[PDB]
Every structure is written in structure tokens, then in C-alpha cells.
Design a protein around this ligand. Structure first.
Ligand SMILES: [Ca+2]
Ligand SMILES: [Ca+2]
Lengths: 218, 223
DNA sequence: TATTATAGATCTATAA
DNA sequence: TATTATAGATCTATAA
């Protein structure tokens, strides 16, 4: 997929270039994953698939030694049970759930940083938060990049948090044929069990002259 | 219901006694609201009902001159569309949705306070966040009071926010005969359309053992 | 009348 | 098996 980046608290210079390369190469090679909506007025319309996207990232990063679902130490258990990925002093959250998760993930990363919790045998120094662009139709209230950017930009204007955060937005060019993975799961909602998966070409149609696009496959 | 409170940034010294009395009396008068779960393997079991509880609070506070769903100003539109209630300088959020909403609600309230957002023709001075105690069985991942307490306590330790916040936890005694409002809605999930509502007798069964902590949630039974 | 953006409701996934 | 705890998925409600 294509990507856009916004950095906070100097993450551009603090983030280890090699660790960033490992995350970036994964995101750039990844096809857009889509599935059918089960929302009442649009059953069957194609939407961004967080399940397939999350699994794709996990399958690429774990073999590169990024530990998945690292447990959060007991002393900070009120902040959660685990973190998506971590390697050395860098935490990664892939966040396609509802929008308040952006501020929950940001604040707990701030506390992980202030208290020096160990990520992967090193104290936490930087967080990477991966999100999807507004351009893709998706479940209602799922977080999107521009909303995350606007929220963190406002927190930065008021000097609210200090931890370095690289915010990543997954995007595609509009009206251009791209690689897509289209999946049908065993149940119309929540299931992560694949029933059918197709690798195809498709595109995101733009009706703008911002509205979200419409995904089509061939 | 009974209430437990935790104040941050001296919300106790800042909160107008009369505004607090209007919120407190409403919450104290309110019976515990329950409904049937549709979660696998516990279909029909009673759980805390956020729909009925939210409606009860709205029906009590609006007549008391609290404004409901106050729009958030354009310059902060990326923080949201509106706030649950407001009266003069006080904002109130009733939060029974999933746990990340606590930090979303805390952080945006911090930003409203820094910029001095008008709430009801007056700059915001304090926020009240209403939550339900852990003791009640409820939808998975719904926010609960002790979790909000522990998170805000950590933020306070690290000086993350300066806005005064009164955190309220709705609770009840265990193994005590209490009145409970039981509501049935037109669909098994998400509906706010009431098909039947009644006040019944019930209690919250304490399922803790010597090896749990008190992290064992209660079981609600009605008669 | 149809979209869209929250806000709120509340399920399943998964491991301890 | 049973349950607790998120974390993630993703719907409906309801007012622009
Ligand atoms: Ca995630
Ligand atoms: Ca609310």
C-alpha cells in the first residue's frame, strides 16, 4: 500500500532507521485488503478489511523478530493486557478499531515511556501507530488517519504528550488499478476464519471534484 | 444507586455544590437498570443496561436545566460533535461504551479546558464522568469505574492533565434486596425501543471465592 | 429522502 | 470446561 507519515516529538530523528525500514517495507508491499460490509444500508459493499490487514502485518513482522502481543507488566495492567508488536525499544500499534482507541493508545504509550517499561529487553522510546486513510469505506467509527492526525496535531499544539510517535496512514492512489485481496470469512461479522480469499486487481473510484471512495474489484 | 467518587485536580473544591446536588440526587434515586445479554453462552443472563441508564439520566437532568448533546465548537470538531450534558461551567459525560472512551473523553476535556470552551454560556471549569462499577456483569470491554480510577490515577501521577474531573462510579451492595428496572427492547442488540419495562425485586449475587480477588463480577437475579 | 460523522452498544477472538 | 480481561470488529441510533 502507499503510506503517509506524520511525526510527533521528533520521532523522525529518534526512530531507529533500520526498525522503520522493517515496518515500511511490510506496509509498502502489502495489497489493500477488503471484505463485505454487513451494515444495514450497504450489505455486501466492499470495505477496508481490518482482519486481513492485521493478519498480513502479523505474518510479516513476526518472522522479522517483532514480537506480537507482548504482555503489559503487572505494574501497568490497568493500561491493558498487551501491545501489538515491539522490537528493541520500539512499540507498534495497528489500530483499525473505534476512534477512541487513538487517544487510549497514545496515552498509554505516553505512560509506557514515562515509566520506562520494557518492550523487547529495552525501555520504550518510540511508538508507531498504523491507521487507514479516510479514503476507504469502512465500518462506522473505525479510526482513520486524518482524524488521528487532527487529534494528535491538536495535542501537540497544546504540548500535551512527550513520547515520540510516528503516525502512519495507509493509502492508495484513486482511479488506478491496484492489487487487492478480497476475503469472505465464515460469518458475516467478527469472524477471522477465512472461507474464500481472492487476489485480484481493483481500484478505488473517486467521485470528488472529501468523500470516501468506492472500492471495486475485477 | 450508591456512588463512589474520585476527584482529580481538586474537582471537589471547584464543583458548584448545587450543580453537584442535581447530579447526585438523580444518581441516588435511580434503580439499577438491567437487560438480557446476547453474548454467546450467556444469552438471557442479566447485565447492566447502558441504554436504560443513559435514558434515565437524560430524563432526570433535562428538566433540571442541564442541556443535552451540546455541540462542540468548529475549532475542535476533530475532537467530536457533542458532549452529553452541560450546565453553566460544568460538562458531564455518561460513559458505558468501550474502555478507550475514558481516555478519549479525558483528553478532549483537557483540551476544552485549556482553550476555555464555553459549555453553557460560561467557560468550562470542571468535568464529571459517570461510570458503572466492576461489580456488575456487563457487555465485554465496557468501561468500569475501577479501571477509569486506575488510569486517571496514573495520568495524575505524571501530570498529564490539569482539568478538574469528578469521576463517579455507580455501585450497589452485594447480597442485598434491591429494586431493579428490567427492560426488554425490540431487538436483541442495540435497540433503544422499549417493548416492556418493569421494576422488580432482585439482588447481586457475590460469586467471589477466597482465591478470586474481588475481580469476580456479581450475578444479577430478579424475582 | 439519502449520506456521513460521531456516539454508543455490544458482539466475537483469544490467551491466561 | 468456565471465566476474566482486554483488544478488536463492527453493528445500530440519531441528528446534521
Ligand atoms: Ca491493534
Ligand atoms: Ca456518553
Amino acid at each position: 500500500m502507499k503510506i503517509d507519515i506524520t511525526d510527533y516529538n521528533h520521532a523522525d530523528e529518534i526512530l531507529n532507521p533500520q526498525l522503520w525500514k522493517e515496518i515500511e517495507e511490510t506496509l509498502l508491499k502489502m495489497p489493500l485488503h477488503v471484505k463485505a460490509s454487513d451494515q444495514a444500508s450497504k450489505v455486501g459493499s466492499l470495505i477496508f478489511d481490518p482482519v486481513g490487514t492485521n493478519q498480513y502485518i502479523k505474518d510479516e513482522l513476526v518472522p522479522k523478530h517483532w514480537k506480537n502481543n507482548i504482555p503489559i507488566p503487572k505494574r501497568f495492567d490497568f493500561l491493558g493486557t498487551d501491545i501489538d508488536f515491539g522490537k528493541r525499544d520500539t512499540l507498534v500499534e495497528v489500530q483499525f478499531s473505534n476512534y477512541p482507541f487513538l487517544l487510549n493508545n497514545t496515552v498509554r504509550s505516553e505512560l509506557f515511556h514515562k515509566s520506562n517499561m520494557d518492550i523487547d529487553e529495552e525501555g520504550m522510546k518510540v511508538a508507531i501507530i498504523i491507521t487507514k486513510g479516510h479514503m476507504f469505506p469502512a465500518s462506522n467509527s473505525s479510526l482513520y488517519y486524518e482524524q488521528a492526525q487532527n487529534q494528535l496535531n491538536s495535542l501537540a499544539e497544546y504540548n500535551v504528550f512527550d513520547v515520540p510517535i510516528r503516525l502512519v496512514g495507509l493509502i492508495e492512489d484513486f482511479e488506478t488499478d491496484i492489487d487487492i485481496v478480497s476475503t469472505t470469512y465464515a460469518d458475516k461479522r467478527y469472524s477471522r476464519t477465512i472461507t474464500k480469499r481472492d487476489t485480484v486487481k481493483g481500484k478505488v473510484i473517486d467521485t470528488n471534484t472529501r468523500k470516501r471512495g468506492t472500492i471495486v474489484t475485477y
